[PDB]
């Protein structure tokens, strides 16, 4: 799994 | 589909979304009113993201503010999801096998799964096309859904506060991207002979979000500036002497030992971290400074204060006497008695509770502090594990000088750990007022089920069984809440629980203490 | 296999006490 | 503070008080409407006292009317405090020691402590600067706070009555300062063959203040003019024949005698003193004339009338049978029985109640009659003890001729005595309607706690223990009210209890009787 | 020391009866 | 203690 999302840092 | 175009009966039915246009009109009126009263500046735009002509799960409202940096346009967006109760999204099917029989499980879809990478890509492309800048850079500022079952006709204050906070967040992210002076504790000395004091508090009514969402909070730790000089003037008048606020509540976990160490261990869960109301700025270096106050709750075992019985009333939901059900004696210890007092309450806590607590956080990718919760979730584990840890270390170094390496070594030491637990977010209407769904914990379940240990053990396994599939655990947790709490439960989102490293908290506290920070209290 | 408890929560435990100026 | 000026994010949040501007607008509209209907005269002004730009605990509304006396301007002010529930004032900390351990007590701040000398000085300076007269003399007319949890949108009648009463009070104080004819009973003869009659009354529903605040009242004594001539015309029509009204209720106190004198003594508490609705004038000499009616309640032991059981219903809160719990027989005397009647009710009262009552008053520095309550509190004891007594004697001499020295000697005889008791003022919402917090008395506590004498004794000591600190007594009293009454208690102010001199009441009554006053009744 | 009652309320007591014309 | 307040009489 380990779904991710948008990040402003990178 | 083609059937309507094949027969073409006069008149039109359905085929529209009516919870977007009204919200847009309300937001435009609120923005005009705020601009009239010299509260904001006419430099941002409000746009509608219709699901019908973009083919997305949920319509959204986006607040875009753009500036120019070295000739390169930069756009900051704060989408606001608008879930609707009049339409049903298709569910997700999963299959599990038991012996010789296979069955299908119908799950449910939350707001968090809707906001995927493709959703943000389409939103960014739409904003770029609308604003006339095709190649402009777009940076996210943190989504915040508007909960359903909320009447927009009589909720003007919450919407106004949400709009102002969204503008503040856009300004914050734009300033961070541009590059400004980092916030450091070296500038907090004030050079006026004042000191910082931390006050602990025990509460019984839940805290409220900016949109009226209740939040469970039993222990509240705040930090204030004490400026009491000799002949202090302004008696009974105080000038906003308050900086931070952290809401905490404790929960009990049982280690698997068969039957000198205490059977139960107390784990403290951090729900909300926020700054003072007066402060309109939110920067990454304030978050760690506010979070450092959590460790201070162990100065005098203040985490155990809510556990002691109150005199006069007994809700019987947070009773501590149920802990004796599995003790050496089968029955429960009877509080609310003339003989019972603090004399043997300490004895009970020594003989059945571990002296040291455990610190945990309920990270939420859709909350107000989404931009930090997502970063910490990435730092916990995933493809972006080194970058997040490096960013966190850099921020901590920027807050308070430098030289954090002497206390921590991120190269060979995990910062955050994922326990593989998913927590539902909802609210249930109690007889008196609306409350929080997280009021149901291990102690509450133990109180509800007096002597049947097997049912309680099934409930406990429904939370953290690694063998059982997560969908079944969510189903069991949703059934148990209905069984115990009531029929008024209304889920609103999802959250994840994580455990901080034991050495990390101590290293952070020691680094801040050595960096010239002095806090005094009882 | 039946669940018995959390065997990993005990690895992370605060050893010290909060340091305050008082 | 400086953090906001250091980062300067666009947009503004909080930083304002919204319960002052709306009240000012409402008061201006009400004043305009009253002036339009030829109800008042355009000679007074309404001003706002903002806490933000004056640095005070609470914002206030002031009604100033100014006149000229011998070329010297005189300004009369009636401030109206505006407490708000959206902000919390800092609490007051106190330390007490028990053996080898010291602890900190967090008290609470009332409206009365806010209105200090510095507050009035700043208010007077602000009014003088605003009205253009720097050296004008300013005289107080009596503060009156507006209770919180009151919706101003639908309370127009109470605000209108409060404004008219405030204007009347300003006129009264201005006329008193200017100097007018004192009110004397010699002008009450009427020279038309009429007589004054006093009517006693027993009530069960609480009286109401000008702002809807309930007041406990069991015995009501009124004075009327009876003008029944021979062929009286106007059948069924009455012309405002009513002058005074005094609200009284009795309470039982137990003398400390170990176990022929009765164990319990009855003490009568005077709550409210007021004139007729038709009379728009309030002068100091009417207050004593109205207060003289209190002693007349003992003509036929009318103070014991509310104690007798009512037929048909039994609230079980004011039951007199609980008095037998500590009697020679442990159990309680069972009323509501066929055999029980007035035949042995008199026997019980003779054998367990002292024949003579005790008179007490609940002085309040923030009530409607603040200007007299403060004077009596000063006369009770303090730096201004001789001046207040001399003023009271002068007023009593002015009312009814003179020669009060033959009945009283203020030089070597105290007028009022302070018992060192502080009474909270609040209201609790009963199931049917809102009631008064003072309904809970010694008999109510005795009824609530059937046989446990120790708990009742602890409650009784929580009121008048001289050894225990006052803050602890207030804490215990606030806990007991929550324990017994309910969760709807809402405190509004503070009051003090005082005991009149036994000889003073008799001397006043005899002086009025000898001064040509004749009152007849049953 | 435990509270037992009010030892000063008994000093102030009305001796007479209300005088009315009737 | 014996806290006091403004008085119009004096």
Numbering used by the authors:
A (entry chain F), F (entry chain C): 622 to 631
B (entry chain D), D (entry chain A): 48 to 306, 319 to 581
C (entry chain E), E (entry chain B): 590 to 611
Pull verbatim passages from the article behind this deposition.
In response, one family of large bacteriophages uses a nucleus-like compartment to protect its replicating genomes by excluding host defence factors. Here we find that the bacteriophage nuclear shell assembles primarily from one protein, which we name chimallin (ChmA). Combining cryo-electron tomography of nuclear shells in bacteriophage-infected cells and cryo-electron microscopy of a minimal chimallin compartment in vitro, we show that chimallin self-assembles as a flexible sheet into closed micrometre-scale compartments. We find that the shell is primarily composed of a single protein, chimallin, which self-assembles through its extended N and C termini into a closed compartment.
Localized reconstruction of the square faces from each particle with C4 symmetry resulted in an improved density map at approximately 3.4 Å resolution. Each tetrameric unit in these assemblies is an 11.5 × 11.5 nm square, in line with our in situ subtomogram analysis of the phage nuclear shell. Atomic models of the C4-symmetric chimallin tetramer and quasi-O-symmetric cubic assemblies reveal the molecular basis for chimallin self-assembly. The N-terminal interacting segment (NTS: residues 48–61) of each protomer extends anticlockwise (as viewed from outside the cube) and docks against a neighbouring protomer’s N-terminal domain within a given face of the cubic assembly, thus establishing intra-tetramer connections. To investigate the interconnectivity of chimallin protomers in the context of the phage nucleus, we docked copies of the high-resolution chimallin tetramer model into the in situ cryo-ET map. The chimallin tetramers fit well into the 24 Å-resolution cryo-ET map of the shell without clashes and with an overall map–model correlation coefficient of 0.56. Docking the tetramer model into maps representing concave, flat, and convex subpopulations indicated that the best fit is to the convex class (model–map correlation coefficient = 0.64), and the worst fit is to the concave class (model–map correlation coefficient = 0.51). The tetramer model derived from the cubic assembly, which represents a highly convex state, shows a further approximately 25° inward tilt of each protomer. These observations suggest that the chimallin tetramer itself is flexible, with the C-terminal domains on the shell’s inner face rotating inward in convex regions of the shell, and outward in concave regions.
